[PDB]
Symmetry: D2
Subunit: 57 residues, 4 copies
C-alpha cells in the first residue's frame, strides 16, 4: 500500500469539507497509483533509461 488513508481523507476534507471517502475508494485509488507508476516505468524503459524522472509521471 503506497497511500496513507488518513492523509487521503484529510486532503479530501481540504477540497470539500462535507465530502466523505468510502472504504472502496481508497482501494480503487491505490490501483490507479500502481497504474501511474507502471506507466512511468514503461515510459523510462521505452527511452532506455534506468532513472524515473518527474516527466515520466
Amino acid at each position: 500500500e503506497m497511500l496513507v488513508k488518513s492523509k487521503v481523507k484529510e486532503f479530501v476534507k481540504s477540497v470539500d469539507p462535507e465530502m466523505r471517502v468510502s472504504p472502496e475508494f481508497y482501494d480503487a485509488l491505490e490501483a490507479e497509483v500502481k497504474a501511474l507508476v507502471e506507466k512511468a516505468i514503461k515510459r523510462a524503459q521505452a527511452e532506455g533509461r534506468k532513472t524515473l524522472y518527474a516527466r515520466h509521471v
Copy 2:
C-alpha cells in the same frame, strides 16, 4: 497533506523493475498526480450531488 509513502513507492518500483532508480522529484510529481486524480473524483461526485467518494468516481 502528503498521501503517498515514498518508501512504499520505491518498494513497488523495485517489484516492477529491480534496476530502475527514482529521481527525488518523481515522488513529488507522483504526489501531485494523485492529488489531481482525487480532485477530479471530487468533481465527479459533486456533479452527481453525492457527499461520498465511491470507487467509480476515481
Copy 3:
C-alpha cells in the same frame, strides 16, 4: 475506428508549441488513449446504472 483527425491533432500541437513535430506512432498512441478514456467513462456510467454518458463520466 479512428475518433481523431490527425491534421487537427497536428494543428493543435502547433498552437501549443510551434517547433514541436509529431511522429506517426504518436497519433496511434493518442488514439488508443482516447479509446481508453471513453471505455473508462462507459464503466463509470455502467457502475452507476446509467444508460447515458454525461460530462461527469469523463
Copy 4:
C-alpha cells in the same frame, strides 16, 4: 476540434450498444484530449525533444 463526434458515437456503440451519448460528453471528451496532448508536449519539452513519440502520451 480534434474529435469526430459521429466516430465517438460509433466507438461507444461498439463497446455498449445500449449506451447513449449526451451532447456535453463530446465537449468534455474534447477538453480531456486537449489536456492529454498538452501533457504529452510538456513531457517532450522536459526531455528536450522537438518530436512527440508514443511514450509521451
